Structure 1
Amino acid sequence: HMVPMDKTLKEFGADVQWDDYAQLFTLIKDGAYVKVKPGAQTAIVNGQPLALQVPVVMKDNKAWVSDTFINDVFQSGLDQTFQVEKRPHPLNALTADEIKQAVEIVKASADFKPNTRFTEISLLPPDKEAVWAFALENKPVDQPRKADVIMLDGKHIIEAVVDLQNNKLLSWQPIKDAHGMVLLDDFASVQNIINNSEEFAAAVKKRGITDAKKVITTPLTVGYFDGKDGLKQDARLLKVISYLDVGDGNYWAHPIENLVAVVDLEQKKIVKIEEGPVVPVPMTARPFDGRDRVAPAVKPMQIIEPEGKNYTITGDMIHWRNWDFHLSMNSRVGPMISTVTYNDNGTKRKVMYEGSLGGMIVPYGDPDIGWYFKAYLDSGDYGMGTLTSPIARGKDAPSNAVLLNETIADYTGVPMEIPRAIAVFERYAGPEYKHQEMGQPNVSTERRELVVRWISTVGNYDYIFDWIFHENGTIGIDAGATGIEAVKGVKAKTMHDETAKDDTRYGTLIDHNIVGTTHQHIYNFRLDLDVDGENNSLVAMDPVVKPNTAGGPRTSTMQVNQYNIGNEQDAAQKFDPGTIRLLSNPNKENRMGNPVSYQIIPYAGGTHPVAKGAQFAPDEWIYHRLSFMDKQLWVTRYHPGERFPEGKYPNRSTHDTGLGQYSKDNESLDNTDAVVWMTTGTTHVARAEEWPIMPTEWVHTLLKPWNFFDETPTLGALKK
Structure 2
Amino acid sequence: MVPMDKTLKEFGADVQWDDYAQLFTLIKDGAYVKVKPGAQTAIVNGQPLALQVPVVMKDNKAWVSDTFINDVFQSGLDQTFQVEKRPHPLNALTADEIKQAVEIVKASADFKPNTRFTEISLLPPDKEAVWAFALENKPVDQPRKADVIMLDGKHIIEAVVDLQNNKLLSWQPIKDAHGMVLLDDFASVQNIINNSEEFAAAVKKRGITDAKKVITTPLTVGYFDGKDGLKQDARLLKVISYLDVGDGNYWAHPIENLVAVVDLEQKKIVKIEEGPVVPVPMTARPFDGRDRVAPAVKPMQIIEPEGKNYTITGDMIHWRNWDFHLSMNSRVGPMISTVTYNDNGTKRKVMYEGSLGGMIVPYGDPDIGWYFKAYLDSGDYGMGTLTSPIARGKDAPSNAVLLNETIADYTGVPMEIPRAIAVFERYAGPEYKHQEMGQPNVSTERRELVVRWISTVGNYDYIFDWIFHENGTIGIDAGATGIEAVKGVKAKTMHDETAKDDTRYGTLIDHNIVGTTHQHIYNFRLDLDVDGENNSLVAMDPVVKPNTAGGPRTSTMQVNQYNIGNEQDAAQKFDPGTIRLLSNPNKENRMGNPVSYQIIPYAGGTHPVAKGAQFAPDEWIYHRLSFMDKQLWVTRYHPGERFPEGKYPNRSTHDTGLGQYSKDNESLDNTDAVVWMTTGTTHVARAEEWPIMPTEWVHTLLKPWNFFDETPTLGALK
TM-score when normalising by structure 1: 0.99
* Cα deviation, residue 52, structure 1: 2.2
| Most deviating of 63-72 and 241-250 | 63-72
CA distance in 2 between partners of 1:401 and 1:363 (Å): 34
Aligned pair 1:585/2:618, yes or no? no
Residues 522-567 of structure 1: CA deviation (Å, up to 9, x unaligned):
0000000000000000000000000001100000000000000000
Aligned pair 1:680/2:679, yes or no? yes
CA distance in 1 between partners of 2:407 and 2:56 (Å): 41
* Cα deviation, residue 8, structure 1: 2.1
CA distance in 1 between partners of 2:133 and 2:642 (Å): 23
* Cα deviation, residue 6, structure 1: 1.5
* Cα deviation, residue 447, structure 1: 0.3
* Cα deviation, residue 44, structure 1: 1.0
CA distance in 2 between partners of 1:258 and 1:24 (Å): 63
Match of 1:246 in 2: 245
CA distance in 1 between partners of 2:457 and 2:56 (Å): 46
Residues 321-366 of structure 1: CA deviation (Å, up to 9, x unaligned):
0000000000000000000000011110000000000000000000
Q: Which runs of 5+ in 2 are unaligned?
A: none
CA distance in 2 between partners of 1:183 and 1:66 (Å): 46
* Cα deviation, residue 114, structure 1: 1.4
Residues 205-261 of structure 1: CA deviation (Å, up to 9, x unaligned):
111111111111000000000001100000000000111111111110011111110
* Cα deviation, residue 65, structure 1: 2.1
* Cα deviation, residue 469, structure 1: 0.4
Residues 471-497 of structure 1: CA deviation (Å, up to 9, x unaligned):
000000000000000001111110001
Match of 1:612 in 2: 611
Secondary structure in structure 2 of the residue aligned to 1:230: coil
Residues 115-144 of structure 1: CA deviation (Å, up to 9, x unaligned):
100000000000000000000011100000
CA distance in 2 between partners of 1:582 and 1:239 (Å): 44
CA distance in 1 between partners of 2:129 and 2:456 (Å): 35
Secondary structure in structure 1 of the residue aligned to 2:256: strand
CA distance in 2 between partners of 1:246 and 1:27 (Å): 43
* Cα deviation, residue 4, structure 1: 2.1
* Cα deviation, residue 148, structure 1: 0.1
CA distance in 2 between partners of 1:204 and 1:11 (Å): 46
| Most deviating of 39-48 and 303-312 | 39-48
* Cα deviation, residue 319, structure 1: 0.4
Alignment of 1:191-340 (within 5 A): 191-340=190-339
CA distance in 2 between partners of 1:80 and 1:542 (Å): 47
CA distance in 2 between partners of 1:681 and 1:695 (Å): 17
Match of 1:494 in 2: 493
| Most deviating of 6-15 and 626-635 | 6-15
Residues 346-395 of structure 1: CA deviation (Å, up to 9, x unaligned):
11000000000000000000001111100000000000000000000000
CA distance in 2 between partners of 1:244 and 1:62 (Å): 48
* Cα deviation, residue 99, structure 1: 0.3
CA distance in 2 between partners of 1:7 and 1:292 (Å): 30
Residues 581-638 of structure 1: CA deviation (Å, up to 9, x unaligned):
0000000000000000000000000000000010001110000000000000000000
CA distance in 1 between partners of 2:352 and 2:223 (Å): 35
* Cα deviation, residue 18, structure 1: 1.2
* Cα deviation, residue 43, structure 1: 1.6
Secondary structure in structure 1 of the residue aligned to 2:323: strand
* Cα deviation, residue 16, structure 1: 1.2
CA distance in 2 between partners of 1:204 and 1:186 (Å): 22
Q: Percent identity?
A: 100
CA distance in 1 between partners of 2:513 and 2:356 (Å): 33
* Cα deviation, residue 37, structure 1: 1.4
Secondary structure in structure 1 of the residue aligned to 2:121: strand
Q: Which runs of 5+ in 1 are unaligned?
A: none
* Cα deviation, residue 53, structure 1: 2.2
CA distance in 2 between partners of 1:7 and 1:278 (Å): 55
CA distance in 2 between partners of 1:157 and 1:711 (Å): 53
* Cα deviation, residue 521, structure 1: 0.2
* Cα deviation, residue 7, structure 1: 2.3
Secondary structure in structure 2 of the residue aligned to 1:297: coil
| Most deviating of 43-52 and 308-317 | 43-52
* Cα deviation, residue 66, structure 1: 2.2
CA distance in 1 between partners of 2:707 and 2:99 (Å): 44
CA distance in 2 between partners of 1:224 and 1:658 (Å): 16
CA distance in 1 between partners of 2:144 and 2:193 (Å): 44
Residues 287-345 of structure 1: CA deviation (Å, up to 9, x unaligned):
10001001210000000000000000001000000000000000000000000000011
| Most deviating of 449-458 and 208-217 | 208-217
CA distance in 1 between partners of 2:257 and 2:26 (Å): 54
Secondary structure in structure 1 of the residue aligned to 2:481: strand
CA distance in 2 between partners of 1:3 and 1:388 (Å): 35
CA distance in 2 between partners of 1:249 and 1:4 (Å): 36
Secondary structure in structure 2 of the residue aligned to 1:35: strand
Secondary structure in structure 2 of the residue aligned to 1:628: helix
* Cα deviation, residue 3, structure 1: 2.5
CA distance in 2 between partners of 1:232 and 1:172 (Å): 27
* Cα deviation, residue 38, structure 1: 1.7
TM-score when normalising by structure 2: 1.00
Match of 1:627 in 2: 626
Residues 394-436 of structure 1: CA deviation (Å, up to 9, x unaligned):
0000000000000000000000000000000000000000000
CA distance in 1 between partners of 2:363 and 2:66 (Å): 55
CA distance in 2 between partners of 1:278 and 1:66 (Å): 66
What is the RMSD of the two structures over their aligned residues, measured on CA atoms?
0.7
Alignment of 1:15-414 (within 5 A): 15-414=14-413
